[PDB]
Amino acid sequence: TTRVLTEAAVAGKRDELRGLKENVIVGRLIPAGTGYAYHQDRMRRRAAG
Amino acid sequence: KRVDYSGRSVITVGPYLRLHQCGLPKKMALELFKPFIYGKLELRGLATTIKAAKKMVEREEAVVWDILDEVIREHPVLLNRAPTLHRLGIQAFEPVLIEGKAIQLHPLVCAAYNADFDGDQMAVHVPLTLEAQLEARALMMSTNNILSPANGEPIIVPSQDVVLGLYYMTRDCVNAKGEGMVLTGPKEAERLYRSGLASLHARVKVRITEYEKDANGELVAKTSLKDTTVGRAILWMIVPKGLPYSIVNQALGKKAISKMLNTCYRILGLKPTVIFADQIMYTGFAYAARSGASVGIDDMVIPEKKHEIISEAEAEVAEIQEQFQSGLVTAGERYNKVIDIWAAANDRVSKAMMDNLQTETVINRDGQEEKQVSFNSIYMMADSGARGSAAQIRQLAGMRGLMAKPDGSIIETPITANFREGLNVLQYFISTHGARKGLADTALKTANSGYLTRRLVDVAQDLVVTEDDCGTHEGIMMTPVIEGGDVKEPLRDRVLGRVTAEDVLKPGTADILVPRNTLLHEQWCDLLEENSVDAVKVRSVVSCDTDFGVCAHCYGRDLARGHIINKGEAIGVIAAQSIGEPGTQLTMR
Amino acid sequence: MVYSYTEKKRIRKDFGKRPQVLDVPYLLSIQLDSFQKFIEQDPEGQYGLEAAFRSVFPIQSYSGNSELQYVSYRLGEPVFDVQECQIRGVTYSAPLRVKLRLVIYEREAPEGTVKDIKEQEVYMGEIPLMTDNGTFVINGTERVIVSQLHRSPGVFFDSDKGKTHSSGKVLYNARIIPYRGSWLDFEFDPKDNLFVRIDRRRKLPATIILRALNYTTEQILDLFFEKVIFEIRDNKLQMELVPERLRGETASFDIEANGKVYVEKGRRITARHIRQLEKDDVKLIEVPVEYIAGKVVAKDYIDESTGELICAANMELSLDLLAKLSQSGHKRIETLFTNDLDHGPYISETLRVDPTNDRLSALVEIYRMMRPGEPPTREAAESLFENLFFSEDRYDLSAVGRMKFNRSLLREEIEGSGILSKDDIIDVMKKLIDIRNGKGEVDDIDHLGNRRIRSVGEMAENQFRVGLVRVERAVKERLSLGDLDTLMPQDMINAKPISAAVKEFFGSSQLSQFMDQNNPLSEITHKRRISALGPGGLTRERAGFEVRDVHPTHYGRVCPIETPEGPNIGLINSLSVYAQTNEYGFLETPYRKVTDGVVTDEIHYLSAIEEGNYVIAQANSNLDEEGHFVEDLVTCRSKGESSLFSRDQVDYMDVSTQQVVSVGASLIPFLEHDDANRALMGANMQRQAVPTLRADKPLVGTGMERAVAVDSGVTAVAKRGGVVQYVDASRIVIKVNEDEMYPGEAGIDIYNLTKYTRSNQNTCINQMPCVSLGEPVERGDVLADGPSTDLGELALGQNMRVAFMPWNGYNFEDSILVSERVVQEDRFTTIHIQELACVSRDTKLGPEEITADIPNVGEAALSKLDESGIVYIGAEVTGGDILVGKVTPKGETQLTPEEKLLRAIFGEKASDVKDSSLRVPNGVSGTVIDVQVFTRDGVEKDKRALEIEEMQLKQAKKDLSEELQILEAGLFSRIRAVLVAGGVEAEKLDKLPRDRWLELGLTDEEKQNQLEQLAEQYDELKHEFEKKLEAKRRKITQGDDLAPGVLKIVKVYLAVKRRIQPGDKMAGRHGNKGVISKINPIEDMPYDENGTPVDIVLNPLGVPSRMNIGQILETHLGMAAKGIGDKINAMLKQQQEVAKLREFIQRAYDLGADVRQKVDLSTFSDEEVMRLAENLRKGMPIATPVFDGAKEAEIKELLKLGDLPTSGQIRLYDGRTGEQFERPVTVGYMYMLKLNHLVDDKMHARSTGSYSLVTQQPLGGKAQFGGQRFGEMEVWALEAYGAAYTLQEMLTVKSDDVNGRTKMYKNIVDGNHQMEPGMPESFNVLLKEIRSLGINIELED
Amino acid sequence: ERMGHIELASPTAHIWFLKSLPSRIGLLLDMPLRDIERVLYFESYVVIE
Structure with a gap:
C-alpha cells in the first residue's frame, strides 16, 4: 500500500472508480450482475451532465 | 466488517425438508426478524406502542409465534459455509421452524457445501429489501444451481446410502420368491409390501407404457412387455414420462444415476429433474433403511492362498539373499528386483482377493451351479461406489502392499497383514509416515491454495461483459490433445461450449458444414465428429477485439443455463476461482 | 496370587498372551x-x-x-x-x-x-x-x-545443500551452538572458500579469526598443511616420493624409481606400480621442472646474504624465480601437495583474499563488523574479543555441551571448561575440511x-x-x-x-x-x-x-x-510409557539383556546412540520357558534396517508391546486394527471427553486405565490405613492399625473430599467414596472416585447398545441417532460451573457498600435478595436477575429546591446512589452452589460476612476435635487400667472422672505421682488443643489483601446440568465422531427377537473407508461381555445357590488360551463371591493389551458361552412397521464419549446490538451479544452470483452507515423495504487517516 | 471529523519518500541514498550553493 500511495501522490492519478473493489470500498453498486444496468445508465447520463 | 444478522449454527442431516427449504431452529428465530414481528404487530393492531410489542416479544406468547410463522412463511433465507472456495459455498433456502438448535441441511447440497456432519459452523444471512429476497430467489437458490460453473458436470452427485440401496434393489440373487409371476407394474409394490415375492425377483414380465418425444414438441405413448426385476419396476413409477426404460434397466451404479439425472435435465428441464432427484433420494433413504446392508467380520473374506503366496514370496527372498551372498548380484539390482517380486506377489494377492470377492457364489438351482454376484457388503458398496474403493478394500482383506516411505525411499520388506488378523508393532510404527506426511501436506497446502486463489481473484477481477460481438475472424486453433500413448481428450468438449468461426470447412472441396457464427449446442459436435475434423477455429477471449472486457460472442455458456451468457455477467469473477478451488494438489514433489 | 482388596470387588479379565515383566513406573x-x-x-x-x-x-x-x-x-x-x-x-x-x-x-x-x-x-x-x-x-x-x-549444545556438521544451493553444488558448513552467548558459524562457498559468521551476520574470511588468535602464517601452513622436504640440491631436482603417502596420479615424463624406471611416461598409474614402488626403498628421484610452477611454497624463505621478502608464503613458484632462489636463498624449500583427488586446500585460496596480515589489523575487522562505527584504540577490540568467546563469566555454555564437543571429535575425556580454546577450533576446521574432502558422515x-x-x-x-x-x-x-x-x-x-x-x-x-x-x-x-x-x-x-x-x-x-x-x-x-530421561538431557528406554540365547530379567536403559549399535529384538517374539527362542530367525533391528537374524546375533529385546505407545493411545483396544490417522483423531478427541453424573465402567479396556487413575492423583487413596471407622459423603476417617502406627500420634487420618469444585474447563470435579462402613483397608488403595473414575478405574463414557444400520437418511455420512431411553435414563448428562465476581472500587465521591437499597427497582426482583445483598445459597436464576446489590455514590449538590423537595417528600435516596448491581448475563440460566466474599483488613462492615466464617470455624473445630477426643479416651483408659486391683472399681471412674479419683494413686506416692503425671499430661493436651484452635481461628478470620482500588471481593458459584440433544458432538474411541441429529422415541427403533430395542443407530457405511475394524471388534466383545452379564443377572435373580454360580464364574474366568492363572473357591470367601457377582452383574469387565490382544477365534469362542451366535448377525424388526429386516445385522455395545463441543455454547444470533466507536462496527465473536464476520471469498462468490444490490445492502444497511440503520429499521416497521446507500463511515475513517500524513486526498464531483 | 495541526517550524522530512525502494529525493537531486540519509542527521554538512 505505502509505495502505491507514494506513487499515486507523486504522479497525481485519479481512479474514476472503475474497478469493482472501488465500488466495494466506496460502497455502491458494482458494474456487474444486477447493478450493471444502473452503472450503464450512470455512464450514459455522465455524457450530458 | 462484522455481520449483524448471522452466526454460528450447527449442521444436521435433513432427510425431509426438500431442496427449496431449510430448517431454522425456533430459538434462533424471533430475533433476526424481530423488526418484522414489530411491523406485523403494529399492522395487526396488537401493539399500539413499540414498548408493548417489545414486552410481548420478550414474553414469547403464542400469538407472537403465529405472527412469526405468518411472516417467515414467505421469506427465503441464505446459508454459507465459513471456509468457502467456489460459488456454491453460499446458497439460499426456505426457512422452516424445527424445535431444535441445529440447522437441518439437505444431504444433496452437502457436496457443494463440502461439509461432513462433524463439528462445523454455518453462517446464516437474511436479505431484507424486497429486491434482495428476489435476487436470492432468482440466482442463489439450489433448484436453479444444478450444474457446475467450473466444467459443466452436475455438482449434485448422489452417493452413499442412496446409490447403495438403488444398486441393491435393482438386483436378483438367482430368482427370489415367485419368479414366473407377471403383472402390470403398479402391482409389484402391492405384492412386495405384503407377501408373494421379494425385491430380488427376476424374470418378471410387465407392461411398460413409455413416453417419447419423437415429434416436435410433444410426446407419444408406447407400451412394451420387456422382462425386468422388481426394483426397476417399482422405480419406473417414480421416473417421469419422458425417460425410456433402458436407463432404469441396469445394475444402476453411481454413473448410471448420474447420467439418468443428466438425461432428465437435458430432456425434460429444470423442475422435472429437481423433483426427480428429490424423489430418488427419498427412495434411497427408504430402501437403504429397508435393505439392511449389514457389515461384520465374516462379511469380509480372507483369501486362503494368501498364505501360499506369502510362502512363495519368502522362498524367493531366501533365494535372492542367497544369490546376493554368492556375490553374483550387486545391491541396487538386489533391492530393485526384491521390490519387483514383492509387487508381483502383491498383485497376485489382490487378484486372489477380488476373485474371492467377485461374482463367485453358488445358489441352489436345477443346475446347482449358478455363480451370480454375491451379496457381501464391502464388495456391494465398492461396485456401487457408495463409499470406498477396491484399492481401499485391498488394505482390509489382503495386504497393505509396500507402504514404505521414510523420506523418499522404500523399505525392503513390506507389510503383510490386514486389519482383521491384527498387525505387528514395527509395521504399525512404519505405517504412520505416509499418514503424517499427508496431514502435513494438507495443513501446509490449504494456506498456499488460499493465497493462490486470492492472487487469481485480484489479478482477474477487472474482467466483465460489456459488448456483444467483436466482429473479428481472429481465433485460436483447437485440436484434440494427441500426445503420449493415446489421446488424453478428443475434440468433444473443447468446442462444446464454444462458437466456431468462418474457417470451419467440410473435408470435401467447396463444401461447408456450418456457417461462421454458430453455437455447438448439442448436435453439431456429432456432425463434426462424423466428418472426423481435427482443426477447429474458435474465437478466444484474446481473439475477440474489443479493447474492454470480453464479448459474449466468444465465450459460450459454461454455466447451469441453456443459453448464451448475457451482458453484465462478470466472467473474471466466474473465472480465477474455479481454477484453484480443487485445492487437493500435491506438495514436496 | 493377587489379593487386591480394593479391586477384589471387580476383577477385569485379560487376554495378555505375553507375560508382563516390568511394572509401569x-x-x-x-x-x-x-x-x-x-x-x-x-x-x-x-x-x-x-x-x-x-x-x-x-x-x-x-x-x-x-x-x-x-x-x-x-x-x-x-x-x-x-x-x-x-x-x-x-x-x-x-x-x-x-x-x-x-x-x-x-x-x-x-x-x-x-x-x-x-x-x-x-x-x-x-x-x-x-x-x-x-x-x-x-x-x-x-x-x-x-x-x-x-x-x-555442541558442533553439528550438516550439509545444507541441494536445490537451495542454486548452483548444482553440495555445501558443507559447521556450526557450534553454546547454551548461552554468541553462536559461531563456518559456512562454505561454492568457490571452495570458507567463511566465518557470527550471529548470522555478514561473512568474514576463514583465516582472519585464526590470525586474531596470535597465529602467524607459517604456523598456519605447518599445522593445516603437510610440508614435503622438496630437496633440490646441485640442480638435481630430486623428490622424496612416498607411494603409500601420496599416489593415484599419472606420471607425465622423466619419472624413475631408484634407478630403473617403474612408471613409464604417459602411463596410467596402477596398483601394481604402487606396490612395486613401496616394496623397494625409494630415495629422492629427479622430476621435470614443470612440477614446480603449479606448486606453491609453504614457508617464507630469505636469502643468506640479505633478508628481502622474496618467495613469500602462499605463492606459486616461477621459472625465473627458481634459478635465483636456488642460487641465493637455499636448496631445500618447503612446499605442498595439493592433491585435488582426495584433498583440497580451501584455505590457501582464502589466505590471499584476507586484506589484513598483522594481528592488530585482523583484530579490528570483527569489531568493524559488530560495531559499524567507533573504531577501537588497541584496548577496546582486544578486551571485547576476549569477552565474546574466551571469557569465563560470559560464555559458560554447559558441561553437556563439552560432552557433545568431545564426543563429536573422538576425545576420551568428559570433563572440561565452558570456555573454548584454539586447539578446539583448529580441530573444528580440520574436521570440516576432512568432511568436505570426505572423511565421515554428516550429523542428523x-x-x-x-x-x-x-x-x-x-x-x-x-x-x-x-x-x-x-x-x-x-x-x-x-x-x-x-x-x-x-x-x-x-x-x-x-x-x-x-x-x-x-x-x-x-x-x-x-x-x-x-x-x-x-x-x-x-x-x-x-x-x-x-x-x-x-x-x-x-x-x-x-x-x-x-x-x-x-x-x-x-x-x-x-x-x-x-x-x-x-x-x-x-x-x-x-x-512413551517406559521412556525416561537421560543423565544430561536425553531420553532413555529400557530393554532386556539377552545373553547367549537365554533372556535375563535385568533391565538396561539405552539412548538413541546406544540403541543404534546393538541388536534389539522385537516384542512380538515368542519365548521358551528357559528364555530361548522357538524359531531360528527373529526379526530384529541393528541400525534402522529391520531384518531377520539368528538367535546368536541379538543382544536385546523389548519389554512389552506398550513401549511405542503413549498413555493417551495405549487405552484404545485392538489398536492394530485401525489406521494411523484414525488412531490420531481417536486419541485427540479422547482428551475432550467429559465425566457424567453416574460414571459407568468400560466393558472393554486395556488395563492401563487403572494405573492412570491411580497415578493422576485425582481420586482419594489410603496411606497407612488398617480399618475405617466413619464414612461420610464428604469426609473419611481411617483407623491405622498398630502395625503401621508409630508412637507419638493419635493414629487416625482424615480425608476431606472435593464436592462440586469449579474446574479450569468450568466442569465439575466430584469424588464419590467406595467403602461403606467398617471395612478393612490396606495401603495404597482408592477410597473416593473422582471425575470419570469407577472403583479406581478410569471410566470415561457409557456402554451403549449400538447397531450398524442405515435409517431413512438419519445417518447420511456422520450423523448419529440417539434413543429416548438414554436421555430418559439421564446418561451422559453434563454439569458445569459458571463463576461471577464483583468489586467495590472506592471513589472520591465515597466508598461503595452492599446494602440492597437499589432504587428504581421492583420488590419482586429484590424479593429474593437478602439484607446484605447477596442471594441465599441454593437458589435458581434465569436471565438477568440481580445477584449482588451495589450502588455508586454521587457528588453533593447545592440547595437546589427541586430535589430538595423530592427528598423532603421521598427521602432516603436523594439521588445519592446509582443502580450498579451485579446481574446475570442474558441467555444464562442455572442455580447457585455457594457464595464467597473477602474483605481487606481495616474494614469490618461484615453485614452478612460472618456466616461463612463461623461455618468454616465449626468445620475446623469439628475436624480437629477427633484427635484430642481419642487421645483423651486413651489417657482415661490408661487411668482406669492403672487403678485396677487398688480397691477402686471402674464404676467410680465411669460415673465421673472425679479427677481420676483425686489422683489418689498412693503406693508409696509413686502411683500417686503417676496419676499426677497423667493429670499434667492431660492439662498439656488441653493447652495444646486450645493453642491449636486459637491459631486456626486467627488463621481463619485474619483478613485478606486486595488491590488498592478495590474494597472487597464477592464471588458466587453457579451450577448448570446439561443434557443430550441433537447438535451435540458425540464421539467414539476409534476416530469416529458424530453429530446427534434426532432423539428418536423408543417405539420407532429396531428391536431384537426378545423385544429389547437398540440404543444408538450408527452408519455402517463408514467402515471400509476409514479402516476401523477396532469398532466392530469392540462391539462383538461387548456382546460377549453383556451376554455374560445378562446370564449372571438371570442366575442371581433366580436366587440360585452359591456353588453353581461360582463354577460358572470360574469357567468364565479361565476361558481362552494361556493368559493368566486365577481361580476362585481358593481365595474368595463364601461372601466375597456374592458381591463379586453383584458388581459384574451388568457386564463382564474385559481388558485387552494394545498389540497383544485377543483373536477372532477367541471372541467367537466367548460368544457361544453366553448363548450368542458366532457370526454376530441378529435379525431385527422395525419399530415403525414391524417388518423383519433381511441381511441380519451385527448389533453391539460401544463405549461412547461426550465432548465439550456442545451446541449449548455454539448458538448465537443478533438483530440490533452494540457497535464499536472505532469504525462503528459491532463487537464480534459473541463478546456481549456480537455477530459473525463476513469473508472476502464470500463477496467473491456473491459477485460470481452478481447480486450487486445485495452487496449494496450488505455494505450499507447492516454496516457502519449510521444514518442507514435507523432508516432501514423504520422502513421495516412501516413495511417500506426501501434502502438508500449513503456512505460507509469506514471510508471516512480511511480518508481521515490518510490525511493524517503528507498526502492530500478528496473526492470530486 | 475535525483535524488538528502542529506548526513544527523546524523543517522535517517525510519518511515515506526517499526511504522506499525508489528515492524520490534521491532521484530528484540525483544524490545517493547514503549521502541524504547521513545529512538528514546533522553529521554531514552538505554545501548548498
Whole structure:
C-alpha cells in the first residue's frame, strides 16, 4: 500500500472508480450482475451532465 | 466488517425438508426478524406502542409465534459455509421452524457445501429489501444451481446410502420368491409390501407404457412387455414420462444415476429433474433403511492362498539373499528386483482377493451351479461406489502392499497383514509416515491454495461483459490433445461450449458444414465428429477485439443455463476461482 | 496370587498372551524430579539452587577489601495450603531465606579481615512450590509448565545443500551452538572458500579469526598443511616420493624409481606400480621442472646474504624465480601437495583474499563488523574479543555441551571448561575440511542423539541465575560506594527484582499454560507433553517440513501417534510409557539383556546412540520357558534396517508391546486394527471427553486405565490405613492399625473430599467414596472416585447398545441417532460451573457498600435478595436477575429546591446512589452452589460476612476435635487400667472422672505421682488443643489483601446440568465422531427377537473407508461381555445357590488360551463371591493389551458361552412397521464419549446490538451479544452470483452507515423495504487517516 | 471529523519518500541514498550553493 500511495501522490492519478473493489470500498453498486444496468445508465447520463 | 444478522449454527442431516427449504431452529428465530414481528404487530393492531410489542416479544406468547410463522412463511433465507472456495459455498433456502438448535441441511447440497456432519459452523444471512429476497430467489437458490460453473458436470452427485440401496434393489440373487409371476407394474409394490415375492425377483414380465418425444414438441405413448426385476419396476413409477426404460434397466451404479439425472435435465428441464432427484433420494433413504446392508467380520473374506503366496514370496527372498551372498548380484539390482517380486506377489494377492470377492457364489438351482454376484457388503458398496474403493478394500482383506516411505525411499520388506488378523508393532510404527506426511501436506497446502486463489481473484477481477460481438475472424486453433500413448481428450468438449468461426470447412472441396457464427449446442459436435475434423477455429477471449472486457460472442455458456451468457455477467469473477478451488494438489514433489 | 482388596470387588479379565515383566513406573516422575532436586539440599554444588549460588555469588568490591559470602539456605514453611490458596486466590509458594556473611578487611593487610556481619539472613522472594501431582496454584488456579525439546549444545556438521544451493553444488558448513552467548558459524562457498559468521551476520574470511588468535602464517601452513622436504640440491631436482603417502596420479615424463624406471611416461598409474614402488626403498628421484610452477611454497624463505621478502608464503613458484632462489636463498624449500583427488586446500585460496596480515589489523575487522562505527584504540577490540568467546563469566555454555564437543571429535575425556580454546577450533576446521574432502558422515537434526529436553527445574535455575546476576551488580556498586560502614547486608539486596522475574516467568510464558481438568487422562498426558516452541529451537510453527517428521529413532522415546493435527503438527509430542530421561538431557528406554540365547530379567536403559549399535529384538517374539527362542530367525533391528537374524546375533529385546505407545493411545483396544490417522483423531478427541453424573465402567479396556487413575492423583487413596471407622459423603476417617502406627500420634487420618469444585474447563470435579462402613483397608488403595473414575478405574463414557444400520437418511455420512431411553435414563448428562465476581472500587465521591437499597427497582426482583445483598445459597436464576446489590455514590449538590423537595417528600435516596448491581448475563440460566466474599483488613462492615466464617470455624473445630477426643479416651483408659486391683472399681471412674479419683494413686506416692503425671499430661493436651484452635481461628478470620482500588471481593458459584440433544458432538474411541441429529422415541427403533430395542443407530457405511475394524471388534466383545452379564443377572435373580454360580464364574474366568492363572473357591470367601457377582452383574469387565490382544477365534469362542451366535448377525424388526429386516445385522455395545463441543455454547444470533466507536462496527465473536464476520471469498462468490444490490445492502444497511440503520429499521416497521446507500463511515475513517500524513486526498464531483 | 495541526517550524522530512525502494529525493537531486540519509542527521554538512 505505502509505495502505491507514494506513487499515486507523486504522479497525481485519479481512479474514476472503475474497478469493482472501488465500488466495494466506496460502497455502491458494482458494474456487474444486477447493478450493471444502473452503472450503464450512470455512464450514459455522465455524457450530458 | 462484522455481520449483524448471522452466526454460528450447527449442521444436521435433513432427510425431509426438500431442496427449496431449510430448517431454522425456533430459538434462533424471533430475533433476526424481530423488526418484522414489530411491523406485523403494529399492522395487526396488537401493539399500539413499540414498548408493548417489545414486552410481548420478550414474553414469547403464542400469538407472537403465529405472527412469526405468518411472516417467515414467505421469506427465503441464505446459508454459507465459513471456509468457502467456489460459488456454491453460499446458497439460499426456505426457512422452516424445527424445535431444535441445529440447522437441518439437505444431504444433496452437502457436496457443494463440502461439509461432513462433524463439528462445523454455518453462517446464516437474511436479505431484507424486497429486491434482495428476489435476487436470492432468482440466482442463489439450489433448484436453479444444478450444474457446475467450473466444467459443466452436475455438482449434485448422489452417493452413499442412496446409490447403495438403488444398486441393491435393482438386483436378483438367482430368482427370489415367485419368479414366473407377471403383472402390470403398479402391482409389484402391492405384492412386495405384503407377501408373494421379494425385491430380488427376476424374470418378471410387465407392461411398460413409455413416453417419447419423437415429434416436435410433444410426446407419444408406447407400451412394451420387456422382462425386468422388481426394483426397476417399482422405480419406473417414480421416473417421469419422458425417460425410456433402458436407463432404469441396469445394475444402476453411481454413473448410471448420474447420467439418468443428466438425461432428465437435458430432456425434460429444470423442475422435472429437481423433483426427480428429490424423489430418488427419498427412495434411497427408504430402501437403504429397508435393505439392511449389514457389515461384520465374516462379511469380509480372507483369501486362503494368501498364505501360499506369502510362502512363495519368502522362498524367493531366501533365494535372492542367497544369490546376493554368492556375490553374483550387486545391491541396487538386489533391492530393485526384491521390490519387483514383492509387487508381483502383491498383485497376485489382490487378484486372489477380488476373485474371492467377485461374482463367485453358488445358489441352489436345477443346475446347482449358478455363480451370480454375491451379496457381501464391502464388495456391494465398492461396485456401487457408495463409499470406498477396491484399492481401499485391498488394505482390509489382503495386504497393505509396500507402504514404505521414510523420506523418499522404500523399505525392503513390506507389510503383510490386514486389519482383521491384527498387525505387528514395527509395521504399525512404519505405517504412520505416509499418514503424517499427508496431514502435513494438507495443513501446509490449504494456506498456499488460499493465497493462490486470492492472487487469481485480484489479478482477474477487472474482467466483465460489456459488448456483444467483436466482429473479428481472429481465433485460436483447437485440436484434440494427441500426445503420449493415446489421446488424453478428443475434440468433444473443447468446442462444446464454444462458437466456431468462418474457417470451419467440410473435408470435401467447396463444401461447408456450418456457417461462421454458430453455437455447438448439442448436435453439431456429432456432425463434426462424423466428418472426423481435427482443426477447429474458435474465437478466444484474446481473439475477440474489443479493447474492454470480453464479448459474449466468444465465450459460450459454461454455466447451469441453456443459453448464451448475457451482458453484465462478470466472467473474471466466474473465472480465477474455479481454477484453484480443487485445492487437493500435491506438495514436496 | 493377587489379593487386591480394593479391586477384589471387580476383577477385569485379560487376554495378555505375553507375560508382563516390568511394572509401569510412577508415570509422573519427570514433572516432579527436576523440581524436587532443584530445592534439594545437596552436599556438592552441581545443579539446582546450590549451583545457582556458587556460580556468581562471591561479591568483590572494586578493591574495596570487602566480600560477601553465604553458609546455606533454608526454605520457609508455606503460609497456607493448597485448598486455602484455591479458596482465596493467592499463589501457593514458599519463602526463601539464606544466611549471609559480610566480611570487611582493613587496608595494608593481605586479606586481613577485621569484622564479619554474618548474624542475620535476608528474605529474597518466594519460590513457587509444587504440589503432589506436579502442579502449581499460581494465582489460585492450577498451573503447569511444559518441558521443552531443543537443540543440544555442541558442533553439528550438516550439509545444507541441494536445490537451495542454486548452483548444482553440495555445501558443507559447521556450526557450534553454546547454551548461552554468541553462536559461531563456518559456512562454505561454492568457490571452495570458507567463511566465518557470527550471529548470522555478514561473512568474514576463514583465516582472519585464526590470525586474531596470535597465529602467524607459517604456523598456519605447518599445522593445516603437510610440508614435503622438496630437496633440490646441485640442480638435481630430486623428490622424496612416498607411494603409500601420496599416489593415484599419472606420471607425465622423466619419472624413475631408484634407478630403473617403474612408471613409464604417459602411463596410467596402477596398483601394481604402487606396490612395486613401496616394496623397494625409494630415495629422492629427479622430476621435470614443470612440477614446480603449479606448486606453491609453504614457508617464507630469505636469502643468506640479505633478508628481502622474496618467495613469500602462499605463492606459486616461477621459472625465473627458481634459478635465483636456488642460487641465493637455499636448496631445500618447503612446499605442498595439493592433491585435488582426495584433498583440497580451501584455505590457501582464502589466505590471499584476507586484506589484513598483522594481528592488530585482523583484530579490528570483527569489531568493524559488530560495531559499524567507533573504531577501537588497541584496548577496546582486544578486551571485547576476549569477552565474546574466551571469557569465563560470559560464555559458560554447559558441561553437556563439552560432552557433545568431545564426543563429536573422538576425545576420551568428559570433563572440561565452558570456555573454548584454539586447539578446539583448529580441530573444528580440520574436521570440516576432512568432511568436505570426505572423511565421515554428516550429523542428523531429527536424530534424538542430537536433541535434549529441558525440564522446569533447569528453567527455574536459569531464570533465578538471570535475576540474581542483576542484583549482584547493584550489590557491587553499593559495596564500592560508601564502603566505610558496618550496616547489615540489606544495602542493595532487593527481593522485588527476583520476585517479579520469577513470577513473570511462571505466570506469563509460552511454556506455562493452564492445565486441562476435563479428564484425568488428559490430566496425565498434559504434564507429559513435549514442545519445541518457546525460548529455543523454533521461533514459530512455520519454516519447516522435515523438522516435524517422525525419525526412525522415535521408537521407544516418543509416541508417533499423540500429536495435534493442526498447524502445530509434528512439534507437540508425548513420551512413551517406559521412556525416561537421560543423565544430561536425553531420553532413555529400557530393554532386556539377552545373553547367549537365554533372556535375563535385568533391565538396561539405552539412548538413541546406544540403541543404534546393538541388536534389539522385537516384542512380538515368542519365548521358551528357559528364555530361548522357538524359531531360528527373529526379526530384529541393528541400525534402522529391520531384518531377520539368528538367535546368536541379538543382544536385546523389548519389554512389552506398550513401549511405542503413549498413555493417551495405549487405552484404545485392538489398536492394530485401525489406521494411523484414525488412531490420531481417536486419541485427540479422547482428551475432550467429559465425566457424567453416574460414571459407568468400560466393558472393554486395556488395563492401563487403572494405573492412570491411580497415578493422576485425582481420586482419594489410603496411606497407612488398617480399618475405617466413619464414612461420610464428604469426609473419611481411617483407623491405622498398630502395625503401621508409630508412637507419638493419635493414629487416625482424615480425608476431606472435593464436592462440586469449579474446574479450569468450568466442569465439575466430584469424588464419590467406595467403602461403606467398617471395612478393612490396606495401603495404597482408592477410597473416593473422582471425575470419570469407577472403583479406581478410569471410566470415561457409557456402554451403549449400538447397531450398524442405515435409517431413512438419519445417518447420511456422520450423523448419529440417539434413543429416548438414554436421555430418559439421564446418561451422559453434563454439569458445569459458571463463576461471577464483583468489586467495590472506592471513589472520591465515597466508598461503595452492599446494602440492597437499589432504587428504581421492583420488590419482586429484590424479593429474593437478602439484607446484605447477596442471594441465599441454593437458589435458581434465569436471565438477568440481580445477584449482588451495589450502588455508586454521587457528588453533593447545592440547595437546589427541586430535589430538595423530592427528598423532603421521598427521602432516603436523594439521588445519592446509582443502580450498579451485579446481574446475570442474558441467555444464562442455572442455580447457585455457594457464595464467597473477602474483605481487606481495616474494614469490618461484615453485614452478612460472618456466616461463612463461623461455618468454616465449626468445620475446623469439628475436624480437629477427633484427635484430642481419642487421645483423651486413651489417657482415661490408661487411668482406669492403672487403678485396677487398688480397691477402686471402674464404676467410680465411669460415673465421673472425679479427677481420676483425686489422683489418689498412693503406693508409696509413686502411683500417686503417676496419676499426677497423667493429670499434667492431660492439662498439656488441653493447652495444646486450645493453642491449636486459637491459631486456626486467627488463621481463619485474619483478613485478606486486595488491590488498592478495590474494597472487597464477592464471588458466587453457579451450577448448570446439561443434557443430550441433537447438535451435540458425540464421539467414539476409534476416530469416529458424530453429530446427534434426532432423539428418536423408543417405539420407532429396531428391536431384537426378545423385544429389547437398540440404543444408538450408527452408519455402517463408514467402515471400509476409514479402516476401523477396532469398532466392530469392540462391539462383538461387548456382546460377549453383556451376554455374560445378562446370564449372571438371570442366575442371581433366580436366587440360585452359591456353588453353581461360582463354577460358572470360574469357567468364565479361565476361558481362552494361556493368559493368566486365577481361580476362585481358593481365595474368595463364601461372601466375597456374592458381591463379586453383584458388581459384574451388568457386564463382564474385559481388558485387552494394545498389540497383544485377543483373536477372532477367541471372541467367537466367548460368544457361544453366553448363548450368542458366532457370526454376530441378529435379525431385527422395525419399530415403525414391524417388518423383519433381511441381511441380519451385527448389533453391539460401544463405549461412547461426550465432548465439550456442545451446541449449548455454539448458538448465537443478533438483530440490533452494540457497535464499536472505532469504525462503528459491532463487537464480534459473541463478546456481549456480537455477530459473525463476513469473508472476502464470500463477496467473491456473491459477485460470481452478481447480486450487486445485495452487496449494496450488505455494505450499507447492516454496516457502519449510521444514518442507514435507523432508516432501514423504520422502513421495516412501516413495511417500506426501501434502502438508500449513503456512505460507509469506514471510508471516512480511511480518508481521515490518510490525511493524517503528507498526502492530500478528496473526492470530486 | 475535525483535524488538528502542529506548526513544527523546524523543517522535517517525510519518511515515506526517499526511504522506499525508489528515492524520490534521491532521484530528484540525483544524490545517493547514503549521502541524504547521513545529512538528514546533522553529521554531514552538505554545501548548498
